[PDB]
């Protein structure tokens, strides 16, 4: 069972080149059944194919993107890869990397990767508890670009737990909540650590939520 | 350059329910379209290609019907994970292009939400901010009124609220609102209170707290 994953900048500022690669991995790339494609989804132009390259070199791009669109293979490292230049905040969106069967079906996507355009630059974000069956959190806040990933004592705790979508503060920075509820009873012998990874800025936060 | 058109853009039914969403294209593509299902937070995921053909290893209550210019999606039974938007996609000829999606979500019976405030904790206003969070978990329908009061005043336009996609188990929704003020506002009042209006409440739910106790 193959797996796709794009890895890239998720900021990149206006008229630069956007870079992202895939990452082929338990397949080989050099296989003739296949086109190897890049999708984005964004809310002003809903999903949109980009383009995709044969394994024997052979592009087509969406002729709507066909100026600053440049897609590449490695076949040394199973990679394919997407340059998109000169972007611009339009070009915010959720990037995928996509396997196309020759005979025309979309039958794996990476799990897609977050791309914002903007001026500014990173930050990493706050992380303040949410104290207290109960409800405990975490409150995530002063970062930029979306996404944060939050887990719950690195996995374990999976049931009940809610991230919320994140909101703009004044600042323009982001803000959500992490909660999850828990019986009463556990406040006075479990511990429960919020796991905060904010990939932009290279962000790791743990913190231990206590009554 | 094929437009397709889908339809409803959004519908919500009952679990068992027979739903049926249409593709239609703007010119004839035979049997060129495949149908995807978007669960909350993931990829897109192929369920029918050529129009018709069900995709290996997934349920039988998916299929697709339809060729030429119009295309019917079809779930047999509807079930609590059937939640997702889905699209239709041509490739006829290049570009390949999707449709607008339709949202696919539950009608379930009432649920009331359980409420819960949280004070900003004193590490936040170290950082000059101060969020007040009110929690609404595992509540249905959608709709909810959340009102905030300082003092017995009433806010408005100082807060944000933020919902999470319908569960894929129980059909309910979780909501979070935020009172965004700063620690010079914060600390020069005491009471700070939480009202909730949704339908499966009979009086409105109030929730509050003094700062400090
Ligand atoms: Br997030
Ligand atoms: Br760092
Ligand atoms: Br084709």
């Known amino acids: 069972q193959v797996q796709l994953q794009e890895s890239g900048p998720g900021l990149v500022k206006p008229s630069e080149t956007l870079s992202l690669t895939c990452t082929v991995s338990?397949?080989?790339?050099?296989?003739?059944?296949?086109?190897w494609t890049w999708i984005r989804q964004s809310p002003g132009k809903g999903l949109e194919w980009i383009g995709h390259?044969?394994?024997?070199?052979?592009?087509n791009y969406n002729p709507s993107l066909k100026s600053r669109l440049t897609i590449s293979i490695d076949t040394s490292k199973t990679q394919f890869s997407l340059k998109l230049s000169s972007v611009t905040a339009a070009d915010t969106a959720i990037y995928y990397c996509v396997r196309d069967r020759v005979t025309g079906a979309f039958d794996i996507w990476g799990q897609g990767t977050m791309v914002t355009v903007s001026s500014a630059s990173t930050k990493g974000p706050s992380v303040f508890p949410l104290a207290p069956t109960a409800a405990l959190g975490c409150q995530v806040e002063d970062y930029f670009p979306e996404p944060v990933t939050v887990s719950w004592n690195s996995g374990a705790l999976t049931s009940g737990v809610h991230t919320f979508p994140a909101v703009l503060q004044s600042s323009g920075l982001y803000e959500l909540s992490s909660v999850v509820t828990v019986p009463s009873s556990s406040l006075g012998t479990q511990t429960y650590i919020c796991n905060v990874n904010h990939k932009p800025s290279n962000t790791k936060v743990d913190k231990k939520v206590e009554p | 350059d094929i437009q397709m058109t889908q339809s409803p853009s959004s519908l919500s039914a009952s679990v068992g329910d027979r739903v049926t969403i249409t593709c239609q294209a703007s010119?004839?593509?035979?049997?060129?379209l495949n149908w995807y299902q978007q669960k909350p937070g993931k990829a897109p995921k192929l369920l029918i290609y050529?129009?018709?053909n069900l995709e290996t290893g997934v349920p039988s209550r998916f299929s697709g019907s339809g060729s030429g210019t119009d295309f019917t999606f079809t779930i047999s039974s509807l079930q609590p994970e059937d939640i997702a938007t889905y699209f239709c996609?041509?490739?006829?000829?290049?570009?390949?292009?999707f449709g607008g999606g339709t949202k696919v979500e539950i009608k379930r019976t009432v649920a009331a939400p359980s409420v819960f405030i949280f004070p900003p904790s004193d590490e936040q206003l170290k950082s000059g901010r101060a969020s007040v969070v009110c929690l609404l978990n595992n509540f249905y329908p959608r709709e909810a009124k959340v009102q905030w009061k300082v003092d017995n005043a009433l806010q408005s336009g100082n807060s944000q609220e933020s919902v999470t996609e319908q569960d894929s188990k129980d059909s309910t929704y979780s909501l979070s609102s935020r009172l965004q003020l700063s620690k010079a506002d914060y600390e020069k009042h005491k009471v700070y209170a939480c009202e909730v209006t949704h339908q499966g409440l009979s009086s409105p739910v109030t929730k509050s707290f003094n700062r400090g106790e």
């Open positions: 050529d129009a018709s």
């Open positions: 010119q004839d593509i035979s049997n060129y």
């Open positions: 338990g397949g080989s790339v050099s296989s003739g059944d296949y086109y």
């Open positions: 996609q041509h490739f006829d000829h290049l570009p390949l292009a």
């Open positions: 390259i044969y394994y024997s070199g052979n592009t």
